[PDB]
Design a binder for this molecule. Sequence first.
Ligand SMILES: Nc1nc2c(ncn2[C@@H]2O[C@H](COP(=O)(O)OP(=O)(O)O)[C@@H](O)[C@H]2O)c(=O)[nH]1
Ligand SMILES: Nc1nc2c(ncn2[C@@H]2O[C@H](COP(=O)(O)OP(=O)(O)O)[C@@H](O)[C@H]2O)c(=O)[nH]1
Lengths: 338, 340
Amino acid sequence: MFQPLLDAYVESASIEKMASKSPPPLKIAVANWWGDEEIKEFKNSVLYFILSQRYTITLHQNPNEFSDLVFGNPQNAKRVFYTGENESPNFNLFDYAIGFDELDFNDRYLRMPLYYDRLHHKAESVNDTTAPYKLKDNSLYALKKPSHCFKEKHPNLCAVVNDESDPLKRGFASFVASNPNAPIRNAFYDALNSIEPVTGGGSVRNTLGYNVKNKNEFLSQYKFNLCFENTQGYGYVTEKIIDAYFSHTIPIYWGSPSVAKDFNPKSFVNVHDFKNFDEAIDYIKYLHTHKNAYLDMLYENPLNTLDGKAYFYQNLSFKKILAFFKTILENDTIYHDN
Amino acid sequence: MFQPLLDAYVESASIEKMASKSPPPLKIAVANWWGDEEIKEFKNSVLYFILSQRYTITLHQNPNEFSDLVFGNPYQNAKRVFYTGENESPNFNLFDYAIGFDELDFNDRYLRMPLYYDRLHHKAESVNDTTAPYKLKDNSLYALKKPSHCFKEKHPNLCAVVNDESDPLKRGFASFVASNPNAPIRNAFYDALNSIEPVTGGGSVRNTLGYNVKNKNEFLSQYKFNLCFENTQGYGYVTEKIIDAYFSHTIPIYWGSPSVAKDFNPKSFVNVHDFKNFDEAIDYIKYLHTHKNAYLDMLYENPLNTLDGKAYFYQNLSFKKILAFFKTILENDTIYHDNP
Ligand SMILES: Nc1nc2c(ncn2[C@@H]2O[C@H](COP(=O)(O)OP(=O)(O)O)[C@@H](O)[C@H]2O)c(=O)[nH]1
Ligand SMILES: Nc1nc2c(ncn2[C@@H]2O[C@H](COP(=O)(O)OP(=O)(O)O)[C@@H](O)[C@H]2O)c(=O)[nH]1
């Protein structure tokens, strides 16, 4: 059930109106080592989107220009590490870091997992008069003019979410991957598949004869999505689980062993809860054969709830991110090695 | 006043006596380049001392041998522990666990054990001496070994001043002992202070004696203050330097970790970090040097902060905390380091 997750995401993007104030100029340098696609990804990231709400940003790649912040990956400006990879920050080289790790380094570190950036993208994609997911009226993501292509590009997804189709009436499980360098994921696919065919839409263990173009639509045509990170890391939860929720399919998840902190464990199969893959496949078989249990899981809120409110772990929100950067900007300390 | 610091350190070293000499084996891999001298030094470090209280330690320097832990900061897939004397944060991609100076919490993966604690271990050992002016509680751990008798002979001036046989006011102004020249802020501050009041240099940097002092602690005891600067700034980076000051019965003029007040009672030393510039700090040093009362108030303060009268090490650093950290490491089978 993606709608409640979207609802919470939208709330988490709520910030105070500053009418009398005007977004001051903020100059951000990105390291030269950064290639063009990496610069375009950063400009399109939720982090950039959030900061553009409070600052008039100029992004550039000139080391001779004095900047407010400099973003990199492994000068006397404040350096900020930000990556999508399963890589812990080097604090000798970077003054501040944004990542997935479950670590507390006071003002020097902020946890903002890639799933939050994937939610940003889903939210914008749903500002469409034909989308099956609703954005609260007049909220930030409802501000831009909507598109009208959603239903056309995701027919089966709209249909199942729109209750015009039966969720039980679908294929077994999808697997979309093109990075082959992930043994555990490759081996769980082989395992599961030898018990029930699993459909492959990416370069890896491909079964279609081509590589799916719309992962979203493709996942909506199956009851489950084999949802493995490329490696294990505590707190390392990427876009993958978000793609499963959004596509209205049960995620069979592996990657971050602490993923239950981030998402409602009743809403997905957590392979980390089992002692071996066999026991996990035993639970996956059960769900596929017990319609109630299957539907119960598919209708759970993807988020955990506390004090009557669904919540993102450690209250990840636009305000948390903005406060983290306001503290960086106001502090003159340079922590990196010189 | 080193005595109360030594008293807290000794209590922090209190743990239960191992039941009947059946200490399980612990194999630790260390630097392959280490010679017998670095090995000797390691076998005498506080971490080794603490672990030897609960394990029978074997050190490994052969790369083709299995170990329970792989230490240091030079065995890709072993249980790796980062530990360095440098002002360097851990690479948690490469190391499963780390011990350092950073004020960071990474749950079971990180423990803060500043070098100052290891320096205290060495001072404690050196005062298990029948001629020392500092006392180790009876029958406690550092008093269990046989005591030496050379302390006073090597630290006459130090013993005199601590033994109340010398006047602390009747001493030179300030000592500076450094041989690592690559320390801008430090070298410059000496120049700043020396230009107002001569500072005696005992190391290779800004040396004024004509030779390098052999016993740092005896030398520092002959001056009212000790210019005690770290080589670089780092939050939590407090090394053996400030301990050497306390031990020498002289007031540390400190700069290094901006948060040093968490570790030590700020009424016991001059925290250069508390001033917007160096002039202001030397103006405060100038004042202490010329107001006997304020000077003696500072020299007599407990080096440690206290809570409800009880002195404490910041975050309760202790042999128990360190042993618990290692017991968790040893019993946890999760591999955290990048697994190729
Ligand atoms: N539409 C589509 N998406 C894909 C394909 N292959 C992988 N993806 C998705 O793109 C993202 C990157 O997956 P991948 O390339 O395997 O690198 P990974 O992040 O290391 O697993 C994941 O969310 C995949 O599900 C494909 O062939 N088509
Ligand atoms: N006895 C003695 N101690 C020294 C001498 N030079 C430095 N030290 C001490 O050795 C330690 C390291 O000093 P140093 O070589 O400058 O490396 P640093 O850690 O960067 O300051 C400090 O505690 C110094 O005070 C010296 O010439 N004689």
